[model samples]
Target: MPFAARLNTPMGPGRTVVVKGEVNANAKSFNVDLLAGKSKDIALHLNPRLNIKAFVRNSFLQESWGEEERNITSFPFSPGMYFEMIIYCDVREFKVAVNGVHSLEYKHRFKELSSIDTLEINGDIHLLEVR
Candidate 1:
């Protein structure tokens, strides 16, 4: 099953997403999980330099995964902003489109897209939809 939501009413102030897996727990640093091949980017309007981390298939592959963390941190996002995320997966990387303006590529952590099943939000948000 997939999950999506649109914020018809304004949410609180600060919210976050926590990622969980068989090996890890309380993965609370990110706000959304863009399932591989899902085709929708995880776009959000928020303060610049948002902190993010991904728990992939294997932590030992940190070399490849680290690049994504660095790239996400370097990007600039502002609060009260509206953006769209286009999600896609390639042979070796995951693609994210930001606000339909730019796209970032990240190494695929798990071999199967289904590995990412949960998306937790920590800050105020208006969930649009999940199809």
Candidate 2:
């Protein structure tokens, strides 16, 4: 089952979601999601496909997935390595950083930021932290 958390406070500009974990040896993929209250909409979805080294970004609204964003200088996740991913909410987008290095940004597709109070993670990883 996926790891999930409910934020005591809703997300907003400058608010952050920090996730720390180690990729499973022989891992294939994992995903992190910021979700709106009591619905299927996802404000942000970060999926790292370690098998292909593709970091996928997207949003899910009204039960539909949006366009994927897959541009990055390099893949940061590796089997047996620790990673800390910070998802920072900006006014217009989400800034992601891995291991103290800036990774990529995804534009806000779901406008109701305050309703985004849940964080979810799934797939092949050994999670150490989430806050």
Candidate 3:
């Protein structure tokens, strides 16, 4: 499963992105990335690894990845289950929720908020909606 799209509007504080999907029955992992417009930089990268039960967060900038963050109360994804992922942009960080449950937050590492205009998704999930 792979997907990519441009953010028609700019990304800034108060902007929200919702992704609805079902994890594949045999899923091992998946990733959702917010990328900088016309560049190889990733503003936010959300990766959930089923095998390890780690919801990883990181950013790629200057062609290199920064430190990873994986502290969570619990993994919120399950195989073959539908999930609604909500991403909210704040002035300092991003708040993410799964199925309406607050999951994690990642600070703005690639601070070019308005320049983040692309969404990229791939790996083990059946996407239903992205907005």
Candidate 4:
């Protein structure tokens, strides 16, 4: 399943995006993407895998994916539960927080700050909030 939304205005440093949802226990994996431009290039792609219990982050530019970043000290997710995912934009990276605790940070790759106007979500999660 997929859920996507376009911001009313562009996003840049000092801007923050918040997402709240429920993860289905039956979910195998899920992804959240911050996109830019008409090409819909991905700025940050967050994938939470249940089978392997890894949180993967990557970017897409010019139709090709970048190296995956999977370095995290903790995993704050589970099946069949509610969660609040916060994405804060920094000048060089995006700091992510889950359920009030810091989770992971993904640096900027698709750096046209103003062009990242799309928020897309996929897999076994619900889009309860986007703002």
State TM-scores per candidate: 0.45, 0.97, 0.97, 0.94
**All candidates' lDDT scores?**
0.36, 0.91, 0.91, 0.86
Candidate order by decreasing lDDT: 2, 3, 4, 1
Give lDDT tens digits, candidate 4, residues 1-131. 47778877777998888888888878778888888858879888889897788999999999999898999888888888888989999899899999999998888988888999998898988667777
Per-residue lDDT for 16-121 in model 3, tens only? 9899999899999999999896887999999999888899999999999889899998899998899999999999999999987899988898887999899999
Q: List candidate 4 stretches off by more than 4 Å.
A: none
Q: Write candidate 2's Cα lDDT for 15-115 as tens digits.
A: 99999999999999999999996786888999999989999999999999988899998898999899999999999999999999999988899988989
What is candidate 1's lDDT per residue for 11-114, written digit by digit as tens?
A: 12222222221111222232444322233333221112333432222112322332234344234233344445444545566555555444455555454544
lDDT of 4 at 82: 89
Cα displacement (Å) at residue 125, model 4:
1.2
Candidate 2 residue pairs that clash: none
Model 4: residue 89 alpha-carbon error in angstroms = 0.2
Tell me the spans in candidate 2 whose CA falls farther than 4 Å from its real position: none
Task: Rate residue 102 of model 1 by lDDT.
Answer: 44
lDDT at residue 27 of model 2 (Cα atoms): 95
The per-residue C-alpha lDDT of model 4 at residue 130 equals 76
TM-score ranking of the models = 3, 2, 4, 1
Q: Estimate the TM-score for candidate 1.
A: 0.45
